[PDB]
Tab-separated table of C-alpha atoms and ligand atoms in Angstrom:
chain	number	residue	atom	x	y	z
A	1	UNK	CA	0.000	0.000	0.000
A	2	UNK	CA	1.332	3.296	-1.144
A	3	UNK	CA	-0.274	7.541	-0.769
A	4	UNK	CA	-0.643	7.518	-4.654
A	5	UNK	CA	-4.370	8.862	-5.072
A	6	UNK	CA	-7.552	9.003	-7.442
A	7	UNK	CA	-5.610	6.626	-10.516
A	8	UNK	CA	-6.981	4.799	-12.587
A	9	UNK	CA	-5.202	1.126	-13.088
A	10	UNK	CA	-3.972	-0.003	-16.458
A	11	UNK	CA	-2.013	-3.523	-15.678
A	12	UNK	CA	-0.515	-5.091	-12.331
A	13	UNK	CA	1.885	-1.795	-11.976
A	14	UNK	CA	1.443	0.827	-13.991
A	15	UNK	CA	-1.385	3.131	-13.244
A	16	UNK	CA	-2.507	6.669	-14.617
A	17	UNK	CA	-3.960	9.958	-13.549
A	18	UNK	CA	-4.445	13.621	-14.794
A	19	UNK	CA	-2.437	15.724	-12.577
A	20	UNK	CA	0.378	18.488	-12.347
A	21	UNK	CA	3.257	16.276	-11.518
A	22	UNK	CA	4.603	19.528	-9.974
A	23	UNK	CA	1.556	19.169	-7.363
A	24	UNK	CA	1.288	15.710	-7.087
A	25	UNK	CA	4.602	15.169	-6.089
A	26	UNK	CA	5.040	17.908	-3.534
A	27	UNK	CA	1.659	16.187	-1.967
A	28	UNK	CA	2.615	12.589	-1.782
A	29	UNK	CA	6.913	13.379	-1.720
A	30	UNK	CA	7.488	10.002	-3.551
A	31	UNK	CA	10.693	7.607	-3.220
A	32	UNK	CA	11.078	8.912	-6.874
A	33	UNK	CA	10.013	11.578	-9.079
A	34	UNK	CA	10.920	11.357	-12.775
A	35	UNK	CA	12.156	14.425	-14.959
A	36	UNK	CA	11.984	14.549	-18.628
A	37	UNK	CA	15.600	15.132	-18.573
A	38	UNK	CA	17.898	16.209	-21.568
A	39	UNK	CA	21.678	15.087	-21.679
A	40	UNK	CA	22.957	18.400	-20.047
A	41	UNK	CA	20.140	18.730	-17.810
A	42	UNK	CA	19.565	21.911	-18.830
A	43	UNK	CA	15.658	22.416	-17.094
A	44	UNK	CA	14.658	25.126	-19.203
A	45	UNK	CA	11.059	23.974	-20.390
A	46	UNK	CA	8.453	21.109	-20.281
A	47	UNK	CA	8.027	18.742	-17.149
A	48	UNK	CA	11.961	19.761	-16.210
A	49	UNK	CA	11.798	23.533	-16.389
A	50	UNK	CA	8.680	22.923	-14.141
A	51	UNK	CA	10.126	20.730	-11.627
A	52	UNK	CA	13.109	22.938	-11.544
A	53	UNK	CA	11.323	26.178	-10.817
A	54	UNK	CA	9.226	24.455	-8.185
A	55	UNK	CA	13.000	23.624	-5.910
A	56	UNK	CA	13.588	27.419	-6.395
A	57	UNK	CA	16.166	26.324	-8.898
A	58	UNK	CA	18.229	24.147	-6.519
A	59	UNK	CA	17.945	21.549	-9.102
A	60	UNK	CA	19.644	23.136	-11.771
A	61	UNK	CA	22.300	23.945	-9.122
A	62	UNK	CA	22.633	20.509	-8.375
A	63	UNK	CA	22.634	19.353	-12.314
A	64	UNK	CA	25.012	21.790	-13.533
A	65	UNK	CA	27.657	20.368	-10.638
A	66	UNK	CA	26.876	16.860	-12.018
A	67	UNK	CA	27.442	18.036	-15.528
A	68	UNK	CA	30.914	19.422	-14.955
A	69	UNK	CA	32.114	16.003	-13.177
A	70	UNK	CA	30.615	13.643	-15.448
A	71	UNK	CA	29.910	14.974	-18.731
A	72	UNK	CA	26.409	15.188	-20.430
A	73	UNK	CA	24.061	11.993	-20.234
A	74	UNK	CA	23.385	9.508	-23.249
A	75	UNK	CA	19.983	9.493	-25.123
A	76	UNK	CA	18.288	6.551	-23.109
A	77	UNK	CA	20.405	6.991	-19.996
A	78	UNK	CA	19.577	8.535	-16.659
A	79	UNK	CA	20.894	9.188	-13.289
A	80	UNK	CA	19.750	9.895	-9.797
A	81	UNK	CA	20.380	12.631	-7.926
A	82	UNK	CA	18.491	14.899	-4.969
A	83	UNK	CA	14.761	15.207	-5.202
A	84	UNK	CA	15.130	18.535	-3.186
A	85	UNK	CA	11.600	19.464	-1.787
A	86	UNK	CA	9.715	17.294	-3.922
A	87	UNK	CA	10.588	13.714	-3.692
A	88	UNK	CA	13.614	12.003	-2.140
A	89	UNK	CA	15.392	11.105	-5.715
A	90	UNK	CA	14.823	12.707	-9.027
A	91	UNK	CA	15.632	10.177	-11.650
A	92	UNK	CA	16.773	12.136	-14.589
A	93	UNK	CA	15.722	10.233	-17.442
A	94	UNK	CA	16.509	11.238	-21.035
A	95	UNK	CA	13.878	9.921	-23.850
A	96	UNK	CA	14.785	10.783	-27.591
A	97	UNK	CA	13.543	14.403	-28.541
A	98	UNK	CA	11.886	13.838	-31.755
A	99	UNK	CA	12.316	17.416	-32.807
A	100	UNK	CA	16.139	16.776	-32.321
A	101	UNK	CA	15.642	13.863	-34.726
A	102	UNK	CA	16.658	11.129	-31.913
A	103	UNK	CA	15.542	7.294	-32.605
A	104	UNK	CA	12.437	6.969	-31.133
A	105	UNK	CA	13.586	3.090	-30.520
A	106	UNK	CA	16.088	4.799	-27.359
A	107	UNK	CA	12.163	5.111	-26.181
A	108	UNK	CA	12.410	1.920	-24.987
A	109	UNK	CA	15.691	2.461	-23.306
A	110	UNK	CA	14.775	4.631	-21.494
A	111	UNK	CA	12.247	3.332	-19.997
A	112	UNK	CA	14.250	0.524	-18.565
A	113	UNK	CA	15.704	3.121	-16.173
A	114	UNK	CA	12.340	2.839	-14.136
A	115	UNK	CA	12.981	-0.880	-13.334
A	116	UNK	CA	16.300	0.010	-11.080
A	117	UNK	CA	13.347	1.633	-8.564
A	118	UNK	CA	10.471	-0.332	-6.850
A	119	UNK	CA	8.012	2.698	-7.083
A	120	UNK	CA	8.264	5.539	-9.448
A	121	UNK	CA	5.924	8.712	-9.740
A	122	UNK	CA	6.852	9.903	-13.217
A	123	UNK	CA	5.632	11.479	-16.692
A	124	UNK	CA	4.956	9.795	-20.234
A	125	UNK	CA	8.722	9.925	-21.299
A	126	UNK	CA	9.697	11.987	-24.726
A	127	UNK	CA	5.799	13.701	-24.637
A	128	UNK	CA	4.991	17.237	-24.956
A	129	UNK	CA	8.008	19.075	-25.906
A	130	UNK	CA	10.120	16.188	-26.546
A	131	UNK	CA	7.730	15.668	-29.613
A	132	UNK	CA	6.571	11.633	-29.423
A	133	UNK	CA	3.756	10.314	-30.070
A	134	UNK	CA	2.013	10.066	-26.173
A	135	UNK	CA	-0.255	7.062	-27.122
A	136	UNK	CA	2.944	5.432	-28.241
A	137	UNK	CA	4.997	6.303	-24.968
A	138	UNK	CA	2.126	4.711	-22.561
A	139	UNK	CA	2.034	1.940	-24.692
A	140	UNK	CA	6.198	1.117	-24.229
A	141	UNK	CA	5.849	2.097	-21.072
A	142	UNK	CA	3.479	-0.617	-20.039
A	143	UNK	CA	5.713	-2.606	-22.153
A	144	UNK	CA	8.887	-1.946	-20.304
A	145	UNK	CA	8.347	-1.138	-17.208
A	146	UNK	CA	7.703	-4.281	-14.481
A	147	UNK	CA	8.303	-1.593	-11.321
A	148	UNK	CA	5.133	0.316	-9.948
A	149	UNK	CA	4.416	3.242	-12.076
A	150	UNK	CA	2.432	5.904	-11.142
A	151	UNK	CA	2.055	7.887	-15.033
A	152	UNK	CA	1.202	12.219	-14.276
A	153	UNK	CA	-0.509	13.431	-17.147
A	154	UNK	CA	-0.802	17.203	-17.477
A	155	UNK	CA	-3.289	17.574	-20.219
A	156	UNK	CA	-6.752	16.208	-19.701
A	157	UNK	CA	-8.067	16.083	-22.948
A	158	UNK	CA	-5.071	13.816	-23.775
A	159	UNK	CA	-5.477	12.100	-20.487
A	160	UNK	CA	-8.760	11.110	-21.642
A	161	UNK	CA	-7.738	9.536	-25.179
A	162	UNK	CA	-4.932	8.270	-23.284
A	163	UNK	CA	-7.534	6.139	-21.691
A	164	UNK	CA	-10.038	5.652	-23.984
A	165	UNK	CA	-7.736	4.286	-26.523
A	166	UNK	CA	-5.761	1.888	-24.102
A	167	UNK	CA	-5.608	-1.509	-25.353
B	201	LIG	O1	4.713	14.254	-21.601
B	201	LIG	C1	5.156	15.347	-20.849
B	201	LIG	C2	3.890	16.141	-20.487
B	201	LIG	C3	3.230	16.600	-21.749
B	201	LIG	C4	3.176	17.867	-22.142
B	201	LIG	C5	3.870	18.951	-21.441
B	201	LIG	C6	4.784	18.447	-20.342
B	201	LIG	N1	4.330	17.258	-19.626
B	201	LIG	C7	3.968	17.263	-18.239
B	201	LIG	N2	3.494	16.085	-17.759
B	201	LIG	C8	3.120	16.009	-16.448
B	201	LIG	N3	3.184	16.986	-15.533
B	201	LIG	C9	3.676	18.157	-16.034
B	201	LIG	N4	3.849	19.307	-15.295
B	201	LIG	C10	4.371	20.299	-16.126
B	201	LIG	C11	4.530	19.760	-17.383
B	201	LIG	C12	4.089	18.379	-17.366
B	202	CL	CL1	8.297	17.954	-21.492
């Protein structure tokens, strides 16, 4: 038994819900909190530039640190670091940006990050700004993912065809 709230269930672990992820994870401070990451984690827009402004930009502090000791990330990769006032870890996970041209098959990739955590509160990876197809994220996520999933989706319209067009 876990605080995750009001989703609805898709398989065994991988559940669904409109929300802010901004808001939902400041109410239920998850193990985990996902970011739509890219390789420099530079948090300028989309899921990241809102879960950076929401730690006061303490996460961008904390990134561009990481950045200068390790180098940028690879497309599919991730790493943890703080979760700041939000969650205990953010897992900084970097889908393909389809307006970059990346391989939408590093979707998949990607995705296998969330299996190295038991529970995960997180968004539909390489949506929105990162220009992928969202019906085709949810359906690699369930896919991929065998950890407990808890998917934040902004939008309610697509929330809603999200669901209705689940298989
Ligand atoms: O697929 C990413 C998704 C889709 C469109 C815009 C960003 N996205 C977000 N998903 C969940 N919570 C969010 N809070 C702020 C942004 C945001
Ligand atoms: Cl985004």
């Amino acid at each position: 038994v876990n605080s995750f709230s009001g989703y609805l269930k898709l398989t065994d672990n991988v559940y669904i819900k409109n929300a802010d992820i901004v808001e939902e994870a400041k109410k239920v401070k998850p193990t985990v909190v996902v970011n739509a990451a890219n390789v420099y984690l530079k948090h300028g827009g989309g899921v990241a530039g809102a879960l950076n402004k929401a730690t006061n930009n303490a996460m961008q502090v904390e990134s561009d640190d990481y950045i200068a000791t390790n180098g940028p990330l690879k497309v599919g990769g991730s790493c943890v670091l703080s979760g700041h006032n939000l969650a205990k870890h953010c897992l900084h996970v970097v889908g393909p940006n389809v307006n970059k041209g990346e391989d939408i098959q590093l979707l998949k990739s990607a995705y296998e990050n969330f299996n190295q955590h038991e529970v995960l509160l997180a968004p539909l990876l390489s949506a929105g700004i990162f220009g992928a197809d969202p019906i085709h994220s949810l359906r690699v996520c369930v896919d991929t993912v065998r950890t407990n999933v808890y998917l934040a989706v902004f939008d309610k319209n697509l929330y809603d065809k999200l669901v209705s067009s689940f298989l």
